[PDB]
Structure formats: C-alpha cells, structure tokens
C-alpha cells in the first residue's frame, strides 16, 4: 500500500481530477508526475496536486 494524507481540501476542476477533504486518507496509485498524483478517494480515482498531500510510509 501507499497511503497519503490530504493536507487541504481540493475540489476537482477537470474530468481527470478528483475531490478530497482535508484529513482524508487516500490510496496513492501513481506518483510519477511531480505536480499531479493519481489517488483513490473512497471509490473514485483521479488526480490531485501532489503538494496538497503527504506520504505516510
């Protein structure tokens, strides 16, 4: 597993993005991009800004 913690709220602005709330724990799916990470937030997958999450492992 790789988990990350949402440091801020983020609301999706494009079709490939997802929404998260501060304090959510998200499953990290792909961190190859330096600016945008693909995560799973409960049941949805998509991108959020990498700077807005913190790796936990």
UniProtKB/Swiss-Prot annotation:
Stretches assigned to the SH3 domain: 1-57
Location(s) in or outside the cell: Cytoplasm, Cytoskeleton; Cytoplasm, Cell cortex
Source organism superkingdom: Eukaryota
Main function: Morphologically, spectrin-like proteins appear to be related to spectrin, showing a flexible rod-like structure. They can bind actin but seem to differ in their calmodulin-binding activity. In nonerythroid tissues, spectrins, in association with some other proteins, may play an important role in membrane organization.
Binding partners and assembly: Like erythrocyte spectrin, the spectrin-like proteins are capable of forming dimers which can further associate to tetramers. Interacts with ACP1.
Family as reported in the entry's similarity comment: Belongs to the spectrin family.
Protein name: Spectrin alpha chain, non-erythrocytic 1
Organism annotation: Gallus gallus (Chicken)
Gene name of this polypeptide: SPTAN1
Shown segment, full-protein numbering: 969 to 1025 of 2477
